[PDB]
């Protein structure tokens, strides 16, 4: 159970029947040729023993060790990715290439994710991860094109054709959702890919591969409001976008009975209605008073303080107001 | 062996918080211990006398003087309380008296018999203070005036409270309440602008105006570099150029021992006569005047002569800029 023992025998890996073995082999192989090739082959063998599940390898192995492992996987297969087109390539090299592009696009999505900072070798590894991330920033569009081509080329160990397509279009949708912050037009492609993977996951019904169902549901919920092309929350958002403010008032009056909407959401829409009314649109004063009255009534029914805007709106009481 | 006399400000304005959260008196005490650590890094400080004078009343002002060991000096440095007034002039007078009371009983001064640079007791006074106004329980002063009310016997022979081998250095604490962002603090330390600055400059020392702990450490390193054994000589330009700053300087010459050895005195500012009953008062720094005209160094064999190295100064920079070691600039005191 060490780095030296596994290199000795050519059959003890079957007797072991692992990610720690992955990081140990790739650390020993990268330390400053037959032994390096043997250790790399052993690392690829135990990586294939996990059936190439990118989630476990992504959470266990760090960025540069996993990059080295997939670079070795591409090195033994074929050895530029955009022009390969995955048509005449062997299925093993094709799935390796799309797997590498899946991992690359997954890491460029995941690098944007916030993480807890450590309070107080490691710096060199951080520099290596930064260099790898910058390199894949330089080659993100090529990986996106390769993944799209692999989604289009559903020609054919060997796994189900839809499942690999489902995973690669799920990663494509995650990429487009990550890109959509800068440009809102990319959210259309994100919604298309997310509808595609939702339809594929509903069609196959096989666990096998494995995707986060809750994350997919949240992605679909986000795409249903970012690019709508139901719930009272989305009804309020839709009627805000369309300007049907009377329906917003009616939904808020009905919500005062049920207390389903967030209080802070209603405060935010009241604030943005006041912001819209203070610029122009002099008819919005009536809407602002109505939604402020509904919010004040809900604040009373939940035992909270009367807002300043309500007292501002009864400085001049009227028959209509009362 | 040198004397390190610390004139700690114990006025109540020293109870001012910095951004460090400690008072100016705490910074003063810590500056003293860090100075003593940096001095103990130098292995030539195996014999070194530390003295402590505060701003309190003259019964209580001298906290550690002669024949006080290290333990008493530390135990009294820790126990300082900043509950007084900013009586800087009286405290400076008491510090100079504590430095100079032994001079007439052991005859270092050599009055009327020439000024011997090898007759020295090298001391520096490091006063740690703030930029607050000087107070004498009747108002502010806004100018430093050392009182002459109870003179030590023989004080009229030198006409200035400080002596030949004494230099006053001010470590003026100006740490603000809130930390100030500055990248130019790595440059040279500015001279302070308080009333202690001219009195530091007239004794051949200088005032340090700190504004951060790193500036404080830089000033303490510079102060450790300035603990030397020598006497301060006022150099003046006699004739024309061969006003530029090299004309006048209260520079320091170095007196290296082997006890120092020497043969010739710096001559007095008067001509001695037996008719005069009273010895004339001489300036504490002998005003020498160098001749800018080039001359030739005149040394014969087996000759007792004393060579004193000047400390780096604008005068030495001016002399070394005119690169000519084969010549020399004759020097003399006036009215001798």
């Amino acid at each position: 159970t060490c780095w030296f023992e596994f290199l000795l025998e050519e059959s003890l890996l079957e007797k072991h029947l692992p990610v720690q073995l992955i990081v140990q082999f790739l650390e020993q192989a990268s330390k400053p040729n037959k032994r390096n090739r043997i250790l790399k082959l052993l690392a690829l063998k135990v990586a294939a023993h996990l059936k190439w599940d990118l989630d476990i390898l992504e959470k266990s192995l760090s960025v540069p060790v996993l990059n080295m492992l997939l670079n070795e996987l591409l090195c033994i297969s074929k050895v530029k990715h955009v022009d390969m087109d995955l048509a005449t390539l062997p299925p093993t090299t094709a799935m390796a290439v799309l797997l590498y592009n899946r991992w690359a696009i997954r890491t460029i999505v995941q690098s944007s994710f916030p993480v807890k900072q450590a309070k107080p070798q490691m710096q060199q590894e951080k520099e290596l991860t930064e260099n790898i991330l910058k390199v894949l920033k330089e080659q993100a569009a090529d990986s996106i094109l390769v993944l799209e081509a692999a989604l289009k080329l559903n020609k054919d160990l060997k796994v189900k054709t839809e499942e690999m397509q489902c995973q690669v279009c799920y990663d494509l949708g995650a990429a487009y959702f990550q890109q959509g912050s800068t440009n809102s037009a990319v959210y259309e492609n994100a919604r298309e890919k997310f509808f595609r993977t939702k339809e594929l996951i509903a069609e196959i019904g096989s666990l096998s591969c494995t995707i986060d169902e809750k994350r997919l549901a949240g992605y679909c919920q986000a795409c249903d409001v970012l690019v709508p092309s139901l719930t009272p929350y989305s009804q309020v958002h839709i009627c805000l976008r369309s300007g049907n403010y009377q329906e917003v008032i009616q939904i808020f009056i009905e919500d005062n009975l049920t207390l389903s909407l967030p209080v802070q959401f209603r405060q935010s829409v009241l604030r943005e209605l006041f912001k819209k009314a203070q610029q122009g649109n002099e008819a919005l004063d009536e809407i602002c008073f109505k939604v402020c009255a509904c919010n004040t009534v809900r604040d009373i029914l939940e035992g909270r303080t009367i807002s300043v805007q309500f007292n501002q709106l009864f400085l001049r009481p009227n028959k209509e107001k009362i | 062996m040198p004397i390190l006399l610390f004139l700690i400000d114990t006025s109540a304005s020293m109870n001012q918080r910095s951004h460090l959260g400690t008072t100016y008196l705490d910074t003063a005490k810590g500056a003293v211990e860090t100075f003593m650590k940096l001095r103990a890094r130098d292995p030539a400080s195996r014999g070194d006398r530390y003295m402590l004078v505060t701003f309190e009343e003259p019964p209580y002002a001298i906290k550690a003087g002669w024949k006080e060991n290290h333990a008493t000096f530390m135990n009294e440095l820790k126990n300082l309380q900043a509950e007084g007034l900013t009586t800087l002039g009286q405290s400076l007078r008491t510090a100079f008296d504590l430095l100079n009371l032994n001079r007439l009983v052991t005859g270092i001064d050599n009055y009327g018999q020439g000024r011997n640079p090898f007759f020295l007791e090298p001391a520096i006074i490091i006063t740690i203070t703030d930029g607050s106004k000087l107070t004498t329980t009747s108002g502010v002063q806004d100018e430093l005036h050392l009182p002459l009310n109870s003179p030590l016997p023989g004080s009229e022979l030198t006409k200035e409270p400080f002596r030949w081998d004494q230099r006053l250095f001010a470590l003026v604490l100006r740490l603000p309440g809130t930390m100030s962002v500055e990248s130019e603090q790595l440059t040279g330390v500015p001279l302070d602008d308080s009333a202690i600055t001219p009195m530091c400059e007239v004794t051949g020392g200088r005032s340090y105006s700190v504004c951060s702990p790193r500036m404080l450490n830089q000033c303490l390193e510079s102060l450790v570099q300035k603990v030397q054994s020598g006497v301060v000589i006022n150099f003046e330009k006699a004739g024309p150029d061969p006003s530029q700053p090299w004309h006048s300087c209260h520079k320091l010459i170095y007196v290296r021992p082997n006890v120092p050895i020497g043969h010739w005195p710096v001559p007095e500012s008067f001509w001695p006569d037996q008719n005069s009953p009273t010895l004339p008062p001489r300036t504490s720094h002998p005003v020498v005047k160098f001749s800018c005209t080039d001359c030739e160094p005149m040394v014969i064999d087996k000759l007792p002569f004393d060579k004193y190295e000047l400390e780096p100064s604008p005068l030495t920079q001016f002399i070394l800029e005119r690169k000519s070691p084969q010549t020399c600039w004759q020097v003399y005191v006036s009215n001798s």
Binding site: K119, P120 | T34, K78, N79, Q81
Partner: protein, 290 residues
């Protein structure tokens, strides 16, 4: 679990160290227990406030014979559980086991020797390597040490603490707002909390240890009156008499390692607080060893 904890405690009473998986299941449960505790942990009287043990395990057994067994006697240890005692691993394991098994009958605070660097330098890391071969147990214990509460407060009056006060700390709300889940820094309020000492002096000062500050009577009086405290218990310094009052009985320094370093010859003591804060000191000699 509880039976397993009791078995581990009665095993550790006779200096048998735990296994690696036992250290796993103990430290990762002490992490869960110590997470809920605040930086200023409210200790209720009665409690027996103890000083530095410093890895002297047989002296800790003597301490338990003097003051009583846990959980019968409530204990409050002010850090320094390790580092140049001959059995630091067994000592820290036993006290962590007592913390896990009886969460309300013992409060263990962080000291200045529960940093990664200090245990690396002063022989706790070497003791873990000698007693276990690998080095995972040492970093397991330091990860536990990151979770230890910084201070303790008995009845809102006695402010138990390993080190002393800080120039940057004026209130207990500052201590409660400190991010204690970190390695002990070289400077700052947490370092001053773990490293400072009192002195007979007129204010603040730089400690001779190179970390933390040193403070006089006026600082202790200002901290006590500004926070409604009557006493500041302390343990970071060595006392030949076991306990020593300072600053007109505002700060008491309690050392609980008799014959410190196995050479100092000190005669340590513990402070027993009654039901109504009627304090008592129990000085004790180093235990005989055969």
């Amino acid at each position: 679990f509880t039976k397993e904890l009791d078995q581990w405690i009665e095993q550790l009473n006779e200096c048998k160290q735990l296994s690696e998986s036992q250290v796993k299941s103990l430290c990762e449960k002490a992490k869960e227990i110590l997470t809920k505790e605040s930086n200023v942990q409210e200790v209720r009287c009665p409690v027996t406030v103890c000083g530095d043990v410093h890895g002297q395990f047989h002296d800790l057994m003597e301490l338990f014979r003097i003051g009583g067994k846990s959980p019968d006697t409530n204990y409050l240890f002010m850090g320094d559980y390790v580092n140049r005692g001959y059995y630091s691993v067994e000592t820290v394991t036993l006290l962590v086991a007592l913390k896990v098994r009886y969460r309300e009958r013992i409060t263990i605070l962080r000291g200045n020797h529960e940093s990664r660097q200090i245990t690396q330098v002063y022989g706790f890391y070497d003791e873990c390597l000698r007693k276990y071969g690998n080095a995972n147990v040492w970093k397991y214990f330091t990860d536990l040490f990151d979770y230890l509460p910084l201070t303790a407060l008995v009845d809102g009056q006695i402010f138990c603490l390993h080190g002393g006060l800080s120039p940057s700390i004026d209130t207990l709300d500052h201590i409660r707002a400190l991010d204690r889940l970190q390695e002990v820094p070289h400077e700052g309020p947490m370092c001053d909390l773990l490293w400072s000492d009192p002195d007979d002096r007129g204010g603040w000062g730089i400690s001779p240890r190179g970390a933390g500050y040193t403070f006089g009577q006026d600082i202790s009086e200002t901290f006590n009156h500004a926070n409604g405290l009557t006493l500041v218990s302390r343990a970071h310094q060595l006392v030949m008499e076991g306990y020593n009052w300072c600053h007109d009985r505002n700060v008491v320094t309690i050392f609980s390692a008799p014959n410190y370093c196995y050479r100092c010859g000190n005669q340590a003591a513990i402070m027993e607080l009654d039901d109504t804060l009627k304090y008592s000191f129990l000085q004790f000699d180093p235990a005989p060893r055969r």
